[PDB]
Amino acid sequence: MASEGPALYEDPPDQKTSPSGKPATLKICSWNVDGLRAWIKKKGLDWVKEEAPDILCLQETKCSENKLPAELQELPGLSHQYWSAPSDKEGYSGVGLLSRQAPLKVSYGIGDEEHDQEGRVIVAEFDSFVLVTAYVPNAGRGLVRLEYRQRWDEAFRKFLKGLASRKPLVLCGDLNVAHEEIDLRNPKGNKKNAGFTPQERQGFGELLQAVPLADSFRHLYPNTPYAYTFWTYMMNARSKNVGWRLDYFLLSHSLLPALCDSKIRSKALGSDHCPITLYLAL
Ligand SMILES: [Mg+2]
């Protein structure tokens, strides 16, 4: 990180109407919170209250479903709350989905035992679309988990293609890959690191192709550099904007006409990731 100084990024203003002029009717916020308790202490809920999304998706809660912070009972506009944590009941990984309205159905996991033990996926079916939030397994230090990650990628893509065959799909969360060079500050130095291996990048391309899905942010901002969602807490990385875009909203092609905007909330503190926000005119 000795070669990088600051690179400026200012997320554009919120575009809240679609290309057809329809006002957004759905606001979804996604956030890897780096520990639910830690994030709450760091005032994450105060930020959520200001953002006022219709649906909030959280990853890396690191929190047993039996040990939820009581502060989550102070979110009256997000009163339907669903959680999945590792089946061993330990405090790591973990996702949550909090919604203004109750979904038609909530499910956990991807229908594959091997991949359903670490609290990584919630599926929330609504009238006109299905929402999936995910915390994708990291490839690990020394890439020791890369083989598992490739198995996960395949199982997950097949699962999502199935869902999308029935209803339009929105996938959000920490997908643990920077797809292209534009998606991280230092592509050259990270090609052998978790999050930017050729294996992971191509797995992401495979996901877009197979389902298929569009990367909402990149669709809208195809040439925009320095837009990241994660910065290591070390090396003063966030202040220099030496980051990675690891957090996405991926959409069925049929939802593109409903796409108003896909935001990166760069200034929102409380984790080593920042929130992302999607506006749809459904
Ligand atoms: Mg973390």
Which helices and strands occur, and which strands form pairs?
Elements: E1 26-32, H1 36-41, H2 44-51, E2 55-59, E3 80-84, E4 95-99, E5 105-108, E6 121-125, E7 130-135, H3 146-164, E8 169-174, H4 198-210, E9 214-215, H5 216-220, H6 237-240, E10 247-251, E11 259-264, E12 276-280
Parallel strand pairs: 1-2, 7-8
Antiparallel strand pairs: 1-12, 2-4, 3-4, 5-6, 6-7, 8-10, 9-10, 11-12
Magnesium ion binds next to loops.
Structural account:
The chain starts with 25 loop residues before the first strand and ends with a strand. Helix 3 packs parallel to helix 4. The chain has helices at 36-41, 44-51, 146-164, 198-210, 216-220, 237-240, and strands at 26-32, 55-59, 80-84, 95-99, 105-108, 121-125, 130-135, 169-174, 214-215, 247-251, 259-264, 276-280. The chain is α+β, with helices and mostly antiparallel strands and 282 residues long. It has a single domain, classed as Deoxyribonuclease I, Chain A (4-Layer Sandwich), CATH 3.60.10. Helices cover 20% and strands 22% of the residues. It binds magnesium ion (MG). The site of magnesium ion has 3 residues, from loops.
